[PDB]
Design a protein around this nucleic acid. Structure first.
Length: 180
DNA sequence: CGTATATATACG
DNA sequence: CGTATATATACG
């Protein structure tokens, strides 16, 4: 197909293995945000790897923002350390990449209207509610948002390879719905 | 901006 | 389910 999705976000989780005290953390980490009313975790953000993290009282933590398996893993480590230095046994157990998002450009318009039809069991398209065809591919289990211009977003991946597979699968199909 | 997608955390 | 988080993408 000659094209390559560029990763755009990676959501990963990890376990610090020690019940945290969020208010404490909220008060001292400073670049934090916290309001157990709206959600039960302290949002915290670093500048490199530029990320954001939801810190949980349970020790568990989610990391979002990254653009590569590693940038995420690193940011995961640095937030782990940040809590470490604030006064708690920050271990780094069970790291795992929960979601990965990617995007690319087929380089041509697509008549969503037909794809929807010839592929109804896979597609969804209510252009007034949202302008993109939600293509829930099955192998690999990747949901793609296909748009009029040819911009495509693959999502719900646990491994970079799923995104590459997914695209390669959807490409020829897309290439066959070139807007007139 | 709200719409809309995947995905883990949490939880009453 | 509400509520929170990131990201490309495009609309009214």
């Amino acid at each position: 197909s000659g094209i390559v999705p560029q990763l755009q976000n990676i959501v990963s989780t990890v376990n610090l293995g020690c019940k945290l005290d969020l208010k404490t953390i909220a008060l001292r980490a400073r670049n934090a945000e916290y309001n157990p009313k709206r959600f039960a975790a302290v949002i915290m953000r670093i500048r490199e790897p530029r990320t954001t993290a939801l810190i949980f009282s349970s020790g568990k933590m989610v990391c979002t923002g990254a653009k590569s398996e590693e940038q995420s893993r690193l940011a995961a480590r640095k937030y782990a350390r940040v809590v470490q230095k604030l006064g708690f046994p920050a271990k780094f157990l069970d790291f795992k990449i929960q979601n990965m998002v990617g995007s690319c450009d087929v380089k041509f318009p697509i008549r969503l209207e037909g794809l929807v039809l010839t592929h109804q069991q896979f597609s969804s398209y209510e252009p007034e509610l949202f302008p993109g065809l939600i293509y829930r591919m099955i192998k690999p289990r990747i949901v793609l948002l296909i748009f009029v211009s040819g911009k495509v977003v693959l999502t719900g991946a646990k491994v970079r390879a799923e995104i590459y597979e997914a695209f390669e699968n959807i490409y020829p199909i897309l290439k066959g719905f070139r807007k007139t």
